Amino acid sequence: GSFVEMVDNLRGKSGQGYYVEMTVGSPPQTLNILVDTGSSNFAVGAAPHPFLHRYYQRQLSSTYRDLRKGVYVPYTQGKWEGELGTDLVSIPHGPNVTVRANIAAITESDKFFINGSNWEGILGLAYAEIARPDDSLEPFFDSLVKQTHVPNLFSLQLCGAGFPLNQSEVLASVGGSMIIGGIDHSLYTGSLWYTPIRREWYYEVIIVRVEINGQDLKMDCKEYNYDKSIVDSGTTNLRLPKKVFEAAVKSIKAASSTEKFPDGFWLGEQLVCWQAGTTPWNIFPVISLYLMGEVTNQSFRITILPQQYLRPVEDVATSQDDCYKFAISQSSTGTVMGAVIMEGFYVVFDRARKRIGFAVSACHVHDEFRTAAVEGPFVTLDMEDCGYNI
Numbered sequence: 001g002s003f004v005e006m007v008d009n010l011r012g013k014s015g016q017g018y019y020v021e022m023t024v025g026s027p028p029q030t031l032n033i034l035v036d037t038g039s040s041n042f043a044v045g046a047a048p049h050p051f052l053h054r055y056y057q058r059q060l061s062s063t064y065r066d067l068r069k070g071v072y073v074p075y076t077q078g079k080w081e082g083e084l085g086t087d088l089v090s091i092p093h094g095p096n097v098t099v100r101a102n103i104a105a106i107t108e109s110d111k112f113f114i115n116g117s118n119w120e121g122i123l124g125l126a127y128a129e130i131a132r133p134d135d136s137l138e139p140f141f142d143s144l145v146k147q148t149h150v151p152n153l154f155s156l157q158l159c160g161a162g163f164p165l166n167q168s169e170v171l172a173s174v175g176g177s178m179i180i181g182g183i184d185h186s187l188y189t190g191s192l193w194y195t196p197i198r199r200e201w202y203y204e205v206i207i208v209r210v211e212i213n214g215q216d217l218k219m220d221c222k223e224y225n226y227d228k229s230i231v232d233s234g235t236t237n238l239r240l241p242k243k244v245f246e247a248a249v250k251s252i253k254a255a256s257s258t259e260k261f262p263d264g265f266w267l268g269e270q271l272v273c274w275q276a277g278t279t280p281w282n283i284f285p286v287i288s289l290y291l292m293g294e295v296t297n298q299s300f301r302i303t304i305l306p307q308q309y310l311r312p313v314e315d316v317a318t319s320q321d322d323c324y325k326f327a328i329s330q331s332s333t334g335t336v337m338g339a340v341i342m343e344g345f346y347v348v349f350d351r352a353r354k355r356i357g358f359a360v361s362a363c364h365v366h367d368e369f370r371t372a373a374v375e376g377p378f379v380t381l382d383m384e385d386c387g388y389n390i
């Protein structure tokens with residue numbers, strides 16, 4: 001592990017998001033910021049809000065610069081509106097550098113800040129193409145790389161606890177690591193396997209095969225990436241295109257058929273509980289996603305366990321049972337490899353080489369009989385045909 005200053009710098013959980021501490025302004029104002037590989041704006045609360053105990057106060061920063069322009073982001077998971085500007089930004093448990101970056105000061109919002117959560121802003125780590133209002137607003141990481149000698153790469157280790165963390169626990173527990181500018185070998189086991197970044201906007205990738213307990217879902221691979229497949233730390237679930245979700249759930253139900261679960265469980269709405277320690281992990285199947293490799297006609301697979309796709313939740317009766325929600329859900333905007341997927345792996349966003357690497361995470365939850373895996377290579381033909389074009 002060569003990046004000790006950044007190891008264990010994240011806090012949070014899949015249902016709340018994972019955040020890192022950052023400072024903005026002069027003198028520095030500390031804020032907790034959600035790490036989001038699914039967007040490209042650095043946006044922070046900049047006005048009082050019932051669910052925030054602190055916010056960016058531009059009038060107290062001597063280095064604040066007003067861009068005299070607004071920004072409006074429509075409902076996705078809450079909507080917000082703000083004013084653009086720039087200021088000096090740093091990451092305390094990060095690279096020892098300070099950079100001038102764009103900041104969207106959020107002044108009005110709806111269903112964006114969450115009651116009970118501990119983050120006050122979001123750090124969009126994707127590319128300029130999807131930045132708002134348009135691609136002229138340079139994202140934070142681009143600024144960081146342009147202004148310093150930090151390598152054009154970051155890596156994320158999101159650590160699910162495997163059980164519920166209460167209010168106090170989630171604040172005191174280490175939720176993972178965001179290594180800025182490098183790869184820390186203490187965070188994974190085995191080898192790193194890389195898949196190409198198909199296009200630089202979201203972190204888009206191409207899935208070429210899907211298995212449920214080794215059984216091929218057998219769909220035209222284009223369906224797996226309709227209309228795109230992305231890696232998104234800002235999404236809790238593994239989200240799959242409608243048709244794929246339908247086929248996958250049928251197969252997961254069949255594999256776990258020795259126990260019947262209500263429709264509400266498969267819809268991700270209701271929890272299921274078992275007596276303490278008796279969760280029947282073994283009846284649930286492993287899920288493997290094969291990704292295009294860097295070599296022609298070669299692919300590799302990442303395999304997750306039910307310990308990744310069943311999200312631990314507190315029982316309504318705060319009993320002693322072990323309860324969970326099914327964290328695979330449908331999407332009309334493509335596959336989203338969210339926290340569910342990311343908690344099983346150390347993920348390397350190698351922007352410099354336009355590729356994303358995966359290795360088994362040193363903090364993934366498993367049991368004595370099965371473990372998450374990253375394996376290859378496999379011979380796979382016509383993988384380009386798996387990508388979707390509008």
Ligand SMILES: CN1C(=N)N[C@@]2(c3ccc(-c4ccc(F)c(C#N)c4)s3)CN(c3ccccc3)C[C@H]2C1=O
Binds near residue numbers: 039132
């Ligand atoms: C899926 N997703 C996302 N990855 N980022 C955004 C998020 C807003 C709130 C998020 C949130 C809140 C609580 C949580 F627990 C988790 C998790 N996990 C995530 S993610 C920012 N965004 C966006 C930003 C700027 C311009 C355009 C779009 C599009 C939003 C969105 O729908």
